[PDB]
Design an enzyme around this catalytic site. Structure first.
Site, PDB file in Angstrom:
ATOM      1  N   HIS A 102       1.500   1.465  -5.729  1.00 44.94           N
ATOM      2  CA  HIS A 102       0.160   0.906  -5.807  1.00 44.94           C
ATOM      3  C   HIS A 102      -0.807   2.012  -6.229  1.00 44.94           C
ATOM      4  O   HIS A 102      -1.693   1.790  -7.054  1.00 44.94           O
ATOM      5  CB  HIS A 102      -0.266   0.345  -4.444  1.00 44.94           C
ATOM      6  CG  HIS A 102      -1.720  -0.009  -4.361  1.00 44.94           C
ATOM      7  ND1 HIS A 102      -2.304  -0.970  -5.159  1.00 44.94           N
ATOM      8  CD2 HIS A 102      -2.708   0.470  -3.567  1.00 44.94           C
ATOM      9  CE1 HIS A 102      -3.586  -1.069  -4.860  1.00 44.94           C
ATOM     10  NE2 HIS A 102      -3.858  -0.206  -3.896  1.00 44.94           N
TER      11      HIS A 102
ATOM     12  N   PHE B 222      -8.178 -16.258  -3.804  1.00 46.01           N
ATOM     13  CA  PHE B 222      -8.446 -14.838  -3.975  1.00 46.01           C
ATOM     14  C   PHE B 222      -9.101 -14.601  -5.334  1.00 46.01           C
ATOM     15  O   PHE B 222     -10.072 -13.851  -5.450  1.00 46.01           O
ATOM     16  CB  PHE B 222      -7.131 -14.058  -3.864  1.00 46.01           C
ATOM     17  CG  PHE B 222      -7.268 -12.577  -4.083  1.00 46.01           C
ATOM     18  CD1 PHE B 222      -8.195 -11.830  -3.359  1.00 46.01           C
ATOM     19  CD2 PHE B 222      -6.434 -11.919  -4.982  1.00 46.01           C
ATOM     20  CE1 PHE B 222      -8.286 -10.448  -3.527  1.00 46.01           C
ATOM     21  CE2 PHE B 222      -6.515 -10.539  -5.157  1.00 46.01           C
ATOM     22  CZ  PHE B 222      -7.445  -9.802  -4.426  1.00 46.01           C
TER      23      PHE B 222
ATOM     24  N   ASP C 168      -8.400  -1.420  -8.157  1.00 46.07           N
ATOM     25  CA  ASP C 168      -7.744  -1.760  -6.895  1.00 46.07           C
ATOM     26  C   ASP C 168      -7.485  -3.271  -6.831  1.00 46.07           C
ATOM     27  O   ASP C 168      -6.488  -3.721  -6.252  1.00 46.07           O
ATOM     28  CB  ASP C 168      -8.642  -1.292  -5.741  1.00 46.07           C
ATOM     29  CG  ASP C 168      -7.920  -1.227  -4.399  1.00 46.07           C
ATOM     30  OD1 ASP C 168      -6.747  -0.793  -4.339  1.00 46.07           O
ATOM     31  OD2 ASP C 168      -8.561  -1.591  -3.392  1.00 46.07           O
TER      32      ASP C 168
ATOM     33  N   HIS D 177       0.801  -1.221   0.000  1.00 45.93           N
ATOM     34  CA  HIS D 177       0.000   0.000   0.000  1.00 45.93           C
ATOM     35  C   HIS D 177       0.837   1.276   0.000  1.00 45.93           C
ATOM     36  O   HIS D 177       0.797   2.059   0.950  1.00 45.93           O
ATOM     37  CB  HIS D 177      -0.948   0.010   1.203  1.00 45.93           C
ATOM     38  CG  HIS D 177      -1.959  -1.091   1.181  1.00 45.93           C
ATOM     39  ND1 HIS D 177      -1.808  -2.256   1.903  1.00 45.93           N
ATOM     40  CD2 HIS D 177      -3.126  -1.214   0.506  1.00 45.93           C
ATOM     41  CE1 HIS D 177      -2.841  -3.047   1.675  1.00 45.93           C
ATOM     42  NE2 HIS D 177      -3.655  -2.439   0.830  1.00 45.93           N
TER      43      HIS D 177
ATOM     44  N   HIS E 146      -6.711   7.212  -2.867  1.00 46.43           N
ATOM     45  CA  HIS E 146      -7.404   6.116  -2.189  1.00 46.43           C
ATOM     46  C   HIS E 146      -6.702   5.316  -1.093  1.00 46.43           C
ATOM     47  O   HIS E 146      -7.386   4.670  -0.295  1.00 46.43           O
ATOM     48  CB  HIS E 146      -8.014   5.151  -3.213  1.00 46.43           C
ATOM     49  CG  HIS E 146      -7.167   3.953  -3.504  1.00 46.43           C
ATOM     50  ND1 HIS E 146      -6.082   3.993  -4.352  1.00 46.43           N
ATOM     51  CD2 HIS E 146      -7.236   2.684  -3.038  1.00 46.43           C
ATOM     52  CE1 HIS E 146      -5.519   2.797  -4.397  1.00 46.43           C
ATOM     53  NE2 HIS E 146      -6.200   1.984  -3.609  1.00 46.43           N
TER      54      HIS E 146
END
Ligand code: CMP
Ligand code: CMP
Ligand code: ZN
Ligand code: ZN
EC number: 3.1.4.53
Lengths: 327, 325
Positions: free
Chosen positions: B77, B285, B231, B73, B113
């Site tokens: 990213h 995932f 994302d 993060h 974000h």
């Protein structure tokens, strides 16, 4: 010196609707929230149940009360004390006997006590429209409500202020969640949806063998507590007229000051905030007709006939304010 | 160097941009250079009268608030989500569907974000009674913070890139950005996907296949899903990139797990390095989160997302093959 005796006498009415809260505020040296909360905790045996040290409770209460603003006419410590005491009476209604746990009771009362802490005397919309730091912090949604919660919880961290120090981890987690759910529900932008759900509950209400309300899931339980505290927050018009008028005088003073700030900034003045074009009486009738009565009539149905006298007073007060209009 | 970076940025409109190379070639300023490139590509500086010096100042400031010691993060990213949203915005089926302001909002939202992300999850911040969780009442804790920081930085000297937007445009932009970023909260994934499916079932397009949106609700919903897809786009990128993203997020996860273990807390899924199955986790995932989302987006913009979906399925097959027995 005997002023203490008079204060103690007034506190004997803690279980009654119409408590002389302004009198108590004066008699307690402007500590209505502290003395009323302490009295209620003793009455409900909450210190023993949750092993709350008395000095810790008093220290937290005084600190919490200190964070309400004495220069804000309505959203102050007296309002907090009033909502706390009103919630306390609503929790004792016959239709809700043995329905809520001690932790849920504690949550409702604590939520009421902190629900407006550090209120600046201006509305969420004013804070949003003026690009305030609070609105920036909370992204324009439930700005003040989020703040009241953050402050109320943060103060528990001060020296000798953690009144929940002896609750189990699970109890603390549950209490925190319920308190957040309750205070966020006081946001007036959620009133219509909150009322809609309360009406749905009344229409599909189920009672036990005793006639007491049956709530078997968190959703329904928290919903009732949210509406309970919301009713307490909107209880001014249901109180004896001498109390109701003092509350109205106070909120009008606060509203007018916000209006003066909006006018000076070239902003459109909020409803009821223009002292040059005000109709206090008509506004109260409107407040009762469109907000307070629809809510209280529904609560009264939920706990029928427990709140009949409260509803009767509300209707009498509406008639009184309306009578001052025919000019 | 500046010549190599300039060449790499030439693929700014391509899915699979060498974002890691760009981060290296720019002195770890992928967010700034990519945002700038995209703004120039969309002529957003001239359209919204954004002083070049102001945009760069804000971007560098914003990028500075992403942590360089957080493996996943971080600013890379952010740059990747921004570039991914930029590409999805050029989807033929979405041509001319959004205004320059809405485009500005989707890209701005993507850029901020995850700003000031600490490297730990919302649940961790909540369970540890963090100051962040205390401030935000355990509700979309990080998302609220990312927004607050992103907007607050606009108030720094020569950082207000929206200074020349009308009062209403600023109000509109702020609302859209908040709506978009709050939607990145994974706890809202299932409801967001559920509503996306509903939109697909009743979707209406032109003869040429261009999507027909009727109001703000429709436009913001597509934008929320667009950024959410961006994302969750790692598994749909060239394997070389996907694997780098996976290595990075696993490192971040393991570090959180170590903290949870030390605190005596229950270790979060995929955060226990002593009982980890990275490959199995990626397949899971993709099967339960990423594929369901992208298959739905693919139908919404059919068939413009086919190549992206094909890559995702190829990567799923590869990761599965790395699992023995
Ligand atoms: N006595 C009153 N007269 C008019 N409006 C009131 C009165 N008491 C409460 N309100 C309104 O009810 C709202 C409840 O939430 P707020 O405190 O945000 O703002 C309050 C006012 O808008
Ligand atoms: N490559 C990846 N591997 C595993 N999980 C991922 C990957 N990329 C994103 N995620 C998950 O998707 C979530 C998206 O929002 P968060 O950043 O809060 O947390 C992210 C992770 O939980
Ligand atoms: Zn209140
Ligand atoms: Zn992200």
């Amino acid at each position: 010196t005997e002023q203490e005796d008079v204060l103690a006498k007034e506190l004997e009415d803690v279980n009654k609707w119409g408590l002389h809260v302004f009198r108590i505020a004066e008699l307690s040296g402007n500590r209505p929230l502290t003395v009323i909360m302490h009295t209620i905790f003793q009455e409900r045996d909450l210190l023993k149940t949750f092993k709350i040290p008395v000095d810790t409770l008093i220290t937290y209460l005084m600190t919490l009360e200190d964070h309400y603003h004495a220069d804000v006419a309505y959203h102050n410590n007296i309002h907090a004390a009033d909502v706390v005491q009103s919630t306390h009476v609503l929790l004792s209604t016959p239709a809700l006997e043995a329905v809520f746990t001690d932790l849920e009771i504690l949550a409702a009362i604590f939520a009421s006590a902190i629900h407006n802490v550090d209120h600046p005397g201006v509305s969420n919309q004013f804070l949003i429209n003026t690009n305030s730091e609070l609105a920036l912090m909370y992204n324009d949604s439930s700005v003040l409500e989020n703040h009241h919660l953050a402050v109320g919880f943060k103060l528990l961290q001060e020296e000798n202020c953690d009144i929940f120090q002896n609750l189990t981890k699970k109890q603390r987690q549950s209490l925190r969640k319920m308190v957040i759910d309750i205070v966020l529900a006081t946001d007036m932008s959620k009133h219509m949806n909150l009322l809609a759900d309360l009406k749905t509950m009344v229409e599909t209400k189920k009672v036990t063998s005793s006639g007491v309300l049956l709530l078997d899931n968190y959703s329904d339980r928290i919903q009732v507590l949210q509406n309970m505290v919301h009713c307490a927050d909107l209880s001014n018009p249901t109180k004896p007229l001498q109390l109701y008028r003092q509350w109205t005088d106070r909120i009008m003073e606060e509203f007018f000051r916000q209006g003066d700030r909006e006018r000076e900034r070239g902003m459109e003045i909020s409803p009821m905030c223009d002292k040059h074009n005000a109709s206090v009486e008509k506004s109260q009738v409107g407040f009762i007709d469109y907000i307070v009565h629809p809510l209280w009539e529904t609560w009264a149905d939920l706990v029928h006939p427990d709140a009949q006298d409260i509803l009767d007073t509300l209707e009498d007060n509406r008639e009184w304010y309306q009578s001052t209009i025919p000019q």
